[PDB]
Design a protein around this ligand. Structure first.
Ligand SMILES: [Zn+2]
Ligand SMILES: [Zn+2]
Length: 60
């Protein structure tokens, strides 16, 4: 399969969310910056980074 964009562990179709071009665990698809649970339209991804609109509005 693939490997988590967060974990060093493997991602399978079991809990694969493909964001941008990387497979993330459904358990790891939430904000990398804080920890807020993101939804399809609420996640802000830029280049290779994915965060909530709060941390996105923090960094950017
Ligand atoms: Zn993971
Ligand atoms: Zn956040």
């Amino acid at each position: 399969g693939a490997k988590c964009g967060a974990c060093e562990k493997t991602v399978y179709h079991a809990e694969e969310i493909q964001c941008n071009g990387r497979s993330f665990h459904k358990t790891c698809f939430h904000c990398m910056a804080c920890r807020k649970a993101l939804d399809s339209t609420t996640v802000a991804a830029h280049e290779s980074e994915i965060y909530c609109k709060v941390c996105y509005g923090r960094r950017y």
